[PDB]
């Protein structure tokens with residue numbers, strides 16, 4: 001599991017801390033949902049568990065980890081190269097991810113069927129396509145922990161439903177992966193195991209759905 005006791009850090013060598021008093025356990029085989037307002041330290045905490053920000057005074061333990069950032073980035077390469085991401089190409093695995101990410105029709109819509117040269121930063125692509133490709137790259141890798149920082153921001157309602165059902169609750173949950181998602185919706189809270197309520201860079205409530213509905 002991913003354990004954190006006493007989160008304390010900031011985006012400066014010295015200054016007022018935006019991470020303060022964070023203690024979270026993320027057990028294996030769990031869909032951990034993080035929710036909060038705009039500016040509650042959701043992404044900051046997501047990077048804190050990744051080892052990206054060395055905390056000042058605190059302990060954090062959990063290793064290679066897949067991650068899909070809020071802003072999608074690509075490579076000046078093909079789409080298959082983006083999704084495989086230096087991984088041995090598979091027939092059933094790659095096609096399963098392609099179908100489970102609602103990308104095959106949009107990929108066939110490109111001027112080249114596949115192996116299309118994605119432009120610099122993705123000029124010949126839109127935001128939804130880039131975010132879908134990023135989630136596909138995060139899903140295709142054979143790892144344990146998978147962080148997804150708001151992958152439903154540039155997607156439709158049907159696209160989000162299909163992605164969470166086929167990929168999250170039936171493909172990530174299939175292999176029993178530690179999936180930590182940061183989004184703000186309601187169709188995902190009953191599907192999760194641990195809800196994390198963030199406010200002003202601090203965890204206000206922590207526990208399960210029944211442990212949250214039975215508290216203030």
Ligand SMILES: Nc1ncnc2c1ncn2[C@@H]1O[C@H](COP(=O)(O)OP(=O)(O)OP(O)(O)=S)[C@@H](O)[C@H]1O
Pocket residue numbers: 011018036037038039040041042043044045070150
């Ligand atoms: N890379 C960075 N460098 C400097 N400051 C940052 C960086 N990322 C975040 N911050 C600061 O951290 C504060 C909170 O950022 P976030 O945790 O990302 O907000 P959030 O609402 O919890 O999550 P979002 O908005 O869905 S990414 C912001 O006011 C930023 O100024």
